[PDB]
């Protein structure tokens, strides 16, 4: 049915030492089987995988495949209207400032995360 | 096809005296004809209309119907992969801080939310 979005990208400010939710949802007009998704981190120096996973079908919650940061928790859920593959990043440091890309296969969203003191 | 979103809501910080884009896009697997949309401001006693309009079809850019703030410009466009009905709010003041809602109706309905915080810096 009729869906709305604030876009494929946004900027989030988060507090040093705290946690933050990196939001991403997806949808398909023609269903899906074993959908692959991946969260990655980019800054001007380095790039790396954070977590990836599989959404088996439109009635199964996302499941983690590999994870490269213990501070990350998958916070996904599969419901009638929304396929949620958001992640929680805990114990933030200033070095966590950067671009977070969520890639979905069988498109990409971008979170610009800025870690601040207050 | 395959779409991705950062959600139906976000928070945007903007600078006093400047401008800001309030983003919203919509999608319908069933398509649409003469889709109605409305931007409202919600941190008052009663909600204040900002601008509403119509998207005729998947090949026509959004068009303004009524507008209640001359500081607002529709920045919409209709392309193959994206139905954009964002607006630009110029000449920001601190009183512009609040909740912005973008409502869409297909002749069901849905709504996206922008929490705008105006700061001096």
PDB file of C-alpha atoms in Angstrom:
ATOM      1  CA  UNK A   1       0.000   0.000   0.000  1.00  0.00           C
ATOM      2  CA  UNK A   2       0.906   3.696   0.222  1.00  0.00           C
ATOM      3  CA  UNK A   3       4.264   4.215   1.943  1.00  0.00           C
ATOM      4  CA  UNK A   4       6.265   7.316   2.905  1.00  0.00           C
ATOM      5  CA  UNK A   5       9.934   7.921   3.611  1.00  0.00           C
ATOM      6  CA  UNK A   6      12.123  10.770   4.812  1.00  0.00           C
ATOM      7  CA  UNK A   7      14.681   9.560   2.277  1.00  0.00           C
ATOM      8  CA  UNK A   8      17.535   7.167   1.535  1.00  0.00           C
ATOM      9  CA  UNK A   9      19.876   9.162   3.750  1.00  0.00           C
ATOM     10  CA  UNK A  10      20.020  11.238   6.910  1.00  0.00           C
ATOM     11  CA  UNK A  11      22.406  12.660   9.503  1.00  0.00           C
ATOM     12  CA  UNK A  12      22.264  11.520  13.121  1.00  0.00           C
ATOM     13  CA  UNK A  13      23.964  13.154  16.085  1.00  0.00           C
ATOM     14  CA  UNK A  14      24.882  10.876  18.956  1.00  0.00           C
ATOM     15  CA  UNK A  15      26.506  11.325  22.347  1.00  0.00           C
ATOM     16  CA  UNK A  16      30.018  10.094  23.107  1.00  0.00           C
ATOM     17  CA  UNK A  17      29.838   7.047  25.372  1.00  0.00           C
ATOM     18  CA  UNK A  18      26.175   6.412  24.639  1.00  0.00           C
ATOM     19  CA  UNK A  19      24.314   4.274  22.108  1.00  0.00           C
ATOM     20  CA  UNK A  20      22.502   5.067  18.878  1.00  0.00           C
ATOM     21  CA  UNK A  21      20.117   3.386  16.462  1.00  0.00           C
ATOM     22  CA  UNK A  22      21.106   3.320  12.807  1.00  0.00           C
ATOM     23  CA  UNK A  23      17.798   3.065  10.966  1.00  0.00           C
ATOM     24  CA  UNK A  24      17.076   1.158   7.782  1.00  0.00           C
ATOM     25  CA  UNK A  25      13.968  -0.449   6.312  1.00  0.00           C
ATOM     26  CA  UNK A  26      13.223  -1.919   2.901  1.00  0.00           C
ATOM     27  CA  UNK A  27      10.277  -3.006   0.799  1.00  0.00           C
ATOM     28  CA  UNK A  28       9.500  -4.973  -2.333  1.00  0.00           C
ATOM     29  CA  UNK A  29       6.464  -4.982  -4.606  1.00  0.00           C
ATOM     30  CA  UNK A  30       7.120  -8.580  -5.652  1.00  0.00           C
ATOM     31  CA  UNK A  31       8.126 -10.315  -2.413  1.00  0.00           C
ATOM     32  CA  UNK A  32      11.557 -11.833  -1.783  1.00  0.00           C
ATOM     33  CA  UNK A  33      13.465 -14.959  -0.767  1.00  0.00           C
ATOM     34  CA  UNK A  34      16.712 -14.989   1.238  1.00  0.00           C
ATOM     35  CA  UNK A  35      17.316 -11.255   0.968  1.00  0.00           C
ATOM     36  CA  UNK A  36      20.884 -10.255   1.783  1.00  0.00           C
ATOM     37  CA  UNK A  37      21.729  -7.072   3.660  1.00  0.00           C
ATOM     38  CA  UNK A  38      24.982  -5.550   4.861  1.00  0.00           C
ATOM     39  CA  UNK A  39      25.973  -2.665   7.107  1.00  0.00           C
ATOM     40  CA  UNK A  40      29.359  -1.090   6.389  1.00  0.00           C
ATOM     41  CA  UNK A  41      31.393   1.789   7.789  1.00  0.00           C
ATOM     42  CA  UNK A  42      33.287   4.373   5.751  1.00  0.00           C
ATOM     43  CA  UNK A  43      35.460   7.302   6.757  1.00  0.00           C
ATOM     44  CA  UNK A  44      38.050   9.212   4.720  1.00  0.00           C
ATOM     45  CA  UNK A  45      40.756   6.713   5.703  1.00  0.00           C
ATOM     46  CA  UNK A  46      39.301   3.251   6.152  1.00  0.00           C
ATOM     47  CA  UNK A  47      36.322   1.054   5.222  1.00  0.00           C
ATOM     48  CA  UNK A  48      34.894  -2.058   6.878  1.00  0.00           C
ATOM     49  CA  UNK A  49      31.998  -4.448   7.275  1.00  0.00           C
ATOM     50  CA  UNK A  50      29.954  -4.128  10.464  1.00  0.00           C
ATOM     51  CA  UNK A  51      27.335  -6.830  10.144  1.00  0.00           C
ATOM     52  CA  UNK A  52      25.454  -8.647   7.432  1.00  0.00           C
ATOM     53  CA  UNK A  53      22.512 -10.984   7.416  1.00  0.00           C
ATOM     54  CA  UNK A  54      19.614 -12.656   5.698  1.00  0.00           C
ATOM     55  CA  UNK A  55      15.869 -12.058   5.596  1.00  0.00           C
ATOM     56  CA  UNK A  56      14.511 -15.459   4.539  1.00  0.00           C
ATOM     57  CA  UNK A  57      11.013 -14.228   3.634  1.00  0.00           C
ATOM     58  CA  UNK A  58       8.311 -11.649   4.418  1.00  0.00           C
ATOM     59  CA  UNK A  59       7.337 -13.579   7.555  1.00  0.00           C
ATOM     60  CA  UNK A  60      10.773 -14.106   9.097  1.00  0.00           C
ATOM     61  CA  UNK A  61      12.787 -11.685  11.220  1.00  0.00           C
ATOM     62  CA  UNK A  62      16.243 -10.717   9.923  1.00  0.00           C
ATOM     63  CA  UNK A  63      19.044 -13.011  11.088  1.00  0.00           C
ATOM     64  CA  UNK A  64      22.710 -12.094  11.555  1.00  0.00           C
ATOM     65  CA  UNK A  65      25.207 -13.916   9.349  1.00  0.00           C
ATOM     66  CA  UNK A  66      28.525 -12.326  10.297  1.00  0.00           C
ATOM     67  CA  UNK A  67      29.346  -9.575  12.792  1.00  0.00           C
ATOM     68  CA  UNK A  68      32.591  -7.613  13.073  1.00  0.00           C
ATOM     69  CA  UNK A  69      31.822  -5.416  16.082  1.00  0.00           C
ATOM     70  CA  UNK A  70      30.678  -6.653  19.495  1.00  0.00           C
ATOM     71  CA  UNK A  71      29.154  -3.213  20.117  1.00  0.00           C
ATOM     72  CA  UNK A  72      26.574  -3.846  17.398  1.00  0.00           C
ATOM     73  CA  UNK A  73      23.171  -5.437  17.948  1.00  0.00           C
ATOM     74  CA  UNK A  74      20.787  -6.213  15.085  1.00  0.00           C
ATOM     75  CA  UNK A  75      17.426  -4.640  15.934  1.00  0.00           C
ATOM     76  CA  UNK A  76      15.520  -5.961  12.964  1.00  0.00           C
ATOM     77  CA  UNK A  77      11.946  -7.140  12.609  1.00  0.00           C
ATOM     78  CA  UNK A  78       9.692  -8.283   9.794  1.00  0.00           C
ATOM     79  CA  UNK A  79       6.085  -7.080   9.988  1.00  0.00           C
ATOM     80  CA  UNK A  80       3.194  -6.699   7.540  1.00  0.00           C
ATOM     81  CA  UNK A  81       4.109  -3.159   6.539  1.00  0.00           C
ATOM     82  CA  UNK A  82       7.798  -2.906   7.350  1.00  0.00           C
ATOM     83  CA  UNK A  83      10.975  -4.863   6.830  1.00  0.00           C
ATOM     84  CA  UNK A  84      13.267  -3.409   9.503  1.00  0.00           C
ATOM     85  CA  UNK A  85      17.015  -4.096   9.476  1.00  0.00           C
ATOM     86  CA  UNK A  86      18.182  -1.345  11.827  1.00  0.00           C
ATOM     87  CA  UNK A  87      21.167  -1.822  14.116  1.00  0.00           C
ATOM     88  CA  UNK A  88      22.141  -0.485  17.521  1.00  0.00           C
ATOM     89  CA  UNK A  89      25.691   0.753  18.018  1.00  0.00           C
ATOM     90  CA  UNK A  90      26.635   0.859  21.705  1.00  0.00           C
ATOM     91  CA  UNK A  91      29.499   2.475  23.636  1.00  0.00           C
ATOM     92  CA  UNK A  92      30.141   5.183  21.049  1.00  0.00           C
ATOM     93  CA  UNK A  93      33.526   6.867  20.599  1.00  0.00           C
ATOM     94  CA  UNK A  94      34.456   9.900  18.525  1.00  0.00           C
ATOM     95  CA  UNK A  95      36.197   7.545  16.055  1.00  0.00           C
ATOM     96  CA  UNK A  96      32.717   6.161  15.268  1.00  0.00           C
ATOM     97  CA  UNK A  97      31.885   9.387  13.393  1.00  0.00           C
ATOM     98  CA  UNK A  98      31.509   8.563   9.706  1.00  0.00           C
ATOM     99  CA  UNK A  99      29.299   7.048   7.020  1.00  0.00           C
ATOM    100  CA  UNK A 100      27.237   3.981   7.636  1.00  0.00           C
ATOM    101  CA  UNK A 101      25.845   2.278   4.576  1.00  0.00           C
ATOM    102  CA  UNK A 102      23.090  -0.291   4.597  1.00  0.00           C
ATOM    103  CA  UNK A 103      23.118  -2.341   1.423  1.00  0.00           C
ATOM    104  CA  UNK A 104      20.247  -4.594   0.347  1.00  0.00           C
ATOM    105  CA  UNK A 105      20.439  -7.220  -2.425  1.00  0.00           C
ATOM    106  CA  UNK A 106      17.594  -8.956  -4.291  1.00  0.00           C
ATOM    107  CA  UNK A 107      19.937  -0.491  -3.167  1.00  0.00           C
ATOM    108  CA  UNK A 108      21.571   1.412  -0.308  1.00  0.00           C
ATOM    109  CA  UNK A 109      20.754   3.810   2.508  1.00  0.00           C
ATOM    110  CA  UNK A 110      23.227   6.113   4.196  1.00  0.00           C
ATOM    111  CA  UNK A 111      23.554   7.331   7.764  1.00  0.00           C
ATOM    112  CA  UNK A 112      26.009  10.131   8.414  1.00  0.00           C
ATOM    113  CA  UNK A 113      26.816   9.626  12.074  1.00  0.00           C
ATOM    114  CA  UNK A 114      28.334  12.509  14.030  1.00  0.00           C
ATOM    115  CA  UNK A 115      29.475  11.745  17.567  1.00  0.00           C
ATOM    116  CA  UNK A 116      29.502  14.800  19.854  1.00  0.00           C
ATOM    117  CA  UNK A 117      30.306  15.630  23.490  1.00  0.00           C
ATOM    118  CA  UNK A 118      26.851  17.029  24.261  1.00  0.00           C
TER     119      UNK A 118
ATOM    120  CA  UNK B   1      11.472  -3.105  -7.472  1.00  0.00           C
ATOM    121  CA  UNK B   2      13.695  -2.915  -4.391  1.00  0.00           C
ATOM    122  CA  UNK B   3      13.494   0.218  -2.234  1.00  0.00           C
ATOM    123  CA  UNK B   4      15.287   1.354   0.934  1.00  0.00           C
ATOM    124  CA  UNK B   5      14.460   4.006   3.550  1.00  0.00           C
ATOM    125  CA  UNK B   6      15.963   5.493   6.699  1.00  0.00           C
ATOM    126  CA  UNK B   7      12.423   5.612   8.085  1.00  0.00           C
ATOM    127  CA  UNK B   8       9.164   7.539   8.278  1.00  0.00           C
ATOM    128  CA  UNK B   9      10.750  10.008  10.681  1.00  0.00           C
ATOM    129  CA  UNK B  10      13.987  11.851  11.376  1.00  0.00           C
ATOM    130  CA  UNK B  11      15.398  14.865  13.218  1.00  0.00           C
ATOM    131  CA  UNK B  12      17.024  17.745  11.343  1.00  0.00           C
ATOM    132  CA  UNK B  13      19.096  20.545  12.854  1.00  0.00           C
ATOM    133  CA  UNK B  14      19.077  23.844  11.000  1.00  0.00           C
ATOM    134  CA  UNK B  15      20.680  27.237  11.413  1.00  0.00           C
ATOM    135  CA  UNK B  16      18.784  30.372  12.402  1.00  0.00           C
ATOM    136  CA  UNK B  17      18.506  32.767   9.461  1.00  0.00           C
ATOM    137  CA  UNK B  18      19.235  30.028   6.946  1.00  0.00           C
ATOM    138  CA  UNK B  19      17.210  27.566   4.893  1.00  0.00           C
ATOM    139  CA  UNK B  20      16.524  23.860   5.264  1.00  0.00           C
ATOM    140  CA  UNK B  21      15.097  21.050   3.163  1.00  0.00           C
ATOM    141  CA  UNK B  22      12.298  19.029   4.728  1.00  0.00           C
ATOM    142  CA  UNK B  23      12.475  15.657   2.942  1.00  0.00           C
ATOM    143  CA  UNK B  24       9.636  13.350   1.996  1.00  0.00           C
ATOM    144  CA  UNK B  25       9.097  10.758  -0.708  1.00  0.00           C
ATOM    145  CA  UNK B  26       6.281   8.286  -1.251  1.00  0.00           C
ATOM    146  CA  UNK B  27       5.779   4.975  -3.007  1.00  0.00           C
ATOM    147  CA  UNK B  28       2.866   2.810  -4.092  1.00  0.00           C
ATOM    148  CA  UNK B  29       3.105  -0.659  -5.628  1.00  0.00           C
ATOM    149  CA  UNK B  30      -0.430  -0.134  -6.954  1.00  0.00           C
ATOM    150  CA  UNK B  31       0.540   3.187  -8.520  1.00  0.00           C
ATOM    151  CA  UNK B  32      -1.420   6.405  -8.086  1.00  0.00           C
ATOM    152  CA  UNK B  33      -3.611   9.027  -9.724  1.00  0.00           C
ATOM    153  CA  UNK B  34      -4.199  12.560  -8.384  1.00  0.00           C
ATOM    154  CA  UNK B  35      -2.411  11.770  -5.131  1.00  0.00           C
ATOM    155  CA  UNK B  36      -2.972  14.396  -2.448  1.00  0.00           C
ATOM    156  CA  UNK B  37      -0.233  15.562  -0.096  1.00  0.00           C
ATOM    157  CA  UNK B  38      -0.050  18.095   2.707  1.00  0.00           C
ATOM    158  CA  UNK B  39       2.730  19.517   4.840  1.00  0.00           C
ATOM    159  CA  UNK B  40       1.661  20.686   8.300  1.00  0.00           C
ATOM    160  CA  UNK B  41       3.362  22.247  11.343  1.00  0.00           C
ATOM    161  CA  UNK B  42       2.417  20.701  14.669  1.00  0.00           C
ATOM    162  CA  UNK B  43       4.071  22.458  17.604  1.00  0.00           C
ATOM    163  CA  UNK B  44       1.159  24.735  18.248  1.00  0.00           C
ATOM    164  CA  UNK B  45      -2.182  24.226  20.057  1.00  0.00           C
ATOM    165  CA  UNK B  46      -3.721  23.453  16.656  1.00  0.00           C
ATOM    166  CA  UNK B  47      -1.844  22.123  13.620  1.00  0.00           C
ATOM    167  CA  UNK B  48      -0.990  24.750  11.015  1.00  0.00           C
ATOM    168  CA  UNK B  49      -1.144  23.932   7.306  1.00  0.00           C
ATOM    169  CA  UNK B  50       2.002  24.871   5.378  1.00  0.00           C
ATOM    170  CA  UNK B  51       1.377  23.698   1.840  1.00  0.00           C
ATOM    171  CA  UNK B  52      -0.604  21.018   0.067  1.00  0.00           C
ATOM    172  CA  UNK B  53      -0.796  19.818  -3.502  1.00  0.00           C
ATOM    173  CA  UNK B  54      -1.423  17.087  -6.021  1.00  0.00           C
ATOM    174  CA  UNK B  55       0.686  14.601  -7.932  1.00  0.00           C
ATOM    175  CA  UNK B  56      -1.355  13.842 -11.056  1.00  0.00           C
ATOM    176  CA  UNK B  57       0.385  10.599 -12.017  1.00  0.00           C
ATOM    177  CA  UNK B  58       3.759   8.837 -12.105  1.00  0.00           C
ATOM    178  CA  UNK B  59       4.875  11.095 -14.971  1.00  0.00           C
ATOM    179  CA  UNK B  60       3.914  14.503 -13.569  1.00  0.00           C
ATOM    180  CA  UNK B  61       5.844  16.646 -11.085  1.00  0.00           C
ATOM    181  CA  UNK B  62       4.035  17.661  -7.880  1.00  0.00           C
ATOM    182  CA  UNK B  63       2.011  20.868  -8.143  1.00  0.00           C
ATOM    183  CA  UNK B  64       1.098  23.248  -5.305  1.00  0.00           C
ATOM    184  CA  UNK B  65      -2.599  23.624  -4.511  1.00  0.00           C
ATOM    185  CA  UNK B  66      -2.589  26.003  -1.543  1.00  0.00           C
ATOM    186  CA  UNK B  67       0.313  27.583   0.349  1.00  0.00           C
ATOM    187  CA  UNK B  68       0.251  29.329   3.730  1.00  0.00           C
ATOM    188  CA  UNK B  69       3.857  30.511   4.099  1.00  0.00           C
ATOM    189  CA  UNK B  70       5.775  32.522   1.509  1.00  0.00           C
ATOM    190  CA  UNK B  71       9.026  31.194   3.001  1.00  0.00           C
ATOM    191  CA  UNK B  72       8.141  27.745   1.658  1.00  0.00           C
ATOM    192  CA  UNK B  73       9.058  26.449  -1.787  1.00  0.00           C
ATOM    193  CA  UNK B  74       7.917  23.082  -3.128  1.00  0.00           C
ATOM    194  CA  UNK B  75      11.029  21.154  -4.238  1.00  0.00           C
ATOM    195  CA  UNK B  76       9.266  18.097  -5.579  1.00  0.00           C
ATOM    196  CA  UNK B  77       9.886  15.987  -8.644  1.00  0.00           C
ATOM    197  CA  UNK B  78       8.525  12.809 -10.149  1.00  0.00           C
ATOM    198  CA  UNK B  79      11.113  10.404 -11.558  1.00  0.00           C
ATOM    199  CA  UNK B  80      11.087   6.690 -12.404  1.00  0.00           C
ATOM    200  CA  UNK B  81      12.394   5.526  -9.030  1.00  0.00           C
ATOM    201  CA  UNK B  82      11.340   8.392  -6.764  1.00  0.00           C
ATOM    202  CA  UNK B  83       8.247  10.434  -6.029  1.00  0.00           C
ATOM    203  CA  UNK B  84       9.703  13.453  -4.229  1.00  0.00           C
ATOM    204  CA  UNK B  85       7.477  15.957  -2.418  1.00  0.00           C
ATOM    205  CA  UNK B  86      10.103  17.703  -0.287  1.00  0.00           C
ATOM    206  CA  UNK B  87       9.844  21.389   0.595  1.00  0.00           C
ATOM    207  CA  UNK B  88      12.371  24.123   1.295  1.00  0.00           C
ATOM    208  CA  UNK B  89      11.817  26.408   4.277  1.00  0.00           C
ATOM    209  CA  UNK B  90      13.806  29.646   4.011  1.00  0.00           C
ATOM    210  CA  UNK B  91      14.611  32.473   6.434  1.00  0.00           C
ATOM    211  CA  UNK B  92      14.422  30.250   9.505  1.00  0.00           C
ATOM    212  CA  UNK B  93      13.600  31.573  12.978  1.00  0.00           C
ATOM    213  CA  UNK B  94      13.766  29.834  16.337  1.00  0.00           C
ATOM    214  CA  UNK B  95       9.953  29.704  16.336  1.00  0.00           C
ATOM    215  CA  UNK B  96      10.176  27.314  13.355  1.00  0.00           C
ATOM    216  CA  UNK B  97      11.427  24.617  15.720  1.00  0.00           C
ATOM    217  CA  UNK B  98       8.814  21.889  15.996  1.00  0.00           C
ATOM    218  CA  UNK B  99       7.205  18.900  14.323  1.00  0.00           C
ATOM    219  CA  UNK B 100       6.630  18.846  10.570  1.00  0.00           C
ATOM    220  CA  UNK B 101       4.249  16.286   9.135  1.00  0.00           C
ATOM    221  CA  UNK B 102       3.910  15.218   5.515  1.00  0.00           C
ATOM    222  CA  UNK B 103       0.587  13.526   4.838  1.00  0.00           C
ATOM    223  CA  UNK B 104      -0.194  11.590   1.652  1.00  0.00           C
ATOM    224  CA  UNK B 105      -3.532  10.233   0.435  1.00  0.00           C
ATOM    225  CA  UNK B 106      -4.208   7.977  -2.555  1.00  0.00           C
ATOM    226  CA  UNK B 107      -7.773   8.435  -3.915  1.00  0.00           C
ATOM    227  CA  UNK B 108      -5.504   4.947   1.956  1.00  0.00           C
ATOM    228  CA  UNK B 109      -3.109   7.390   3.632  1.00  0.00           C
ATOM    229  CA  UNK B 110       0.260   7.690   5.379  1.00  0.00           C
ATOM    230  CA  UNK B 111       2.428  10.283   7.147  1.00  0.00           C
ATOM    231  CA  UNK B 112       6.103  11.080   7.604  1.00  0.00           C
ATOM    232  CA  UNK B 113       7.530  13.267  10.347  1.00  0.00           C
ATOM    233  CA  UNK B 114      10.393  15.750  10.520  1.00  0.00           C
ATOM    234  CA  UNK B 115      11.479  17.050  13.904  1.00  0.00           C
ATOM    235  CA  UNK B 116      13.123  20.364  13.094  1.00  0.00           C
ATOM    236  CA  UNK B 117      15.431  21.989  15.642  1.00  0.00           C
ATOM    237  CA  UNK B 118      16.630  25.497  14.864  1.00  0.00           C
ATOM    238  CA  UNK B 119      19.962  26.395  16.461  1.00  0.00           C
ATOM    239  CA  UNK B 120      22.149  29.502  16.393  1.00  0.00           C
ATOM    240  CA  UNK B 121      25.118  27.315  15.454  1.00  0.00           C
TER     241      UNK B 121
END
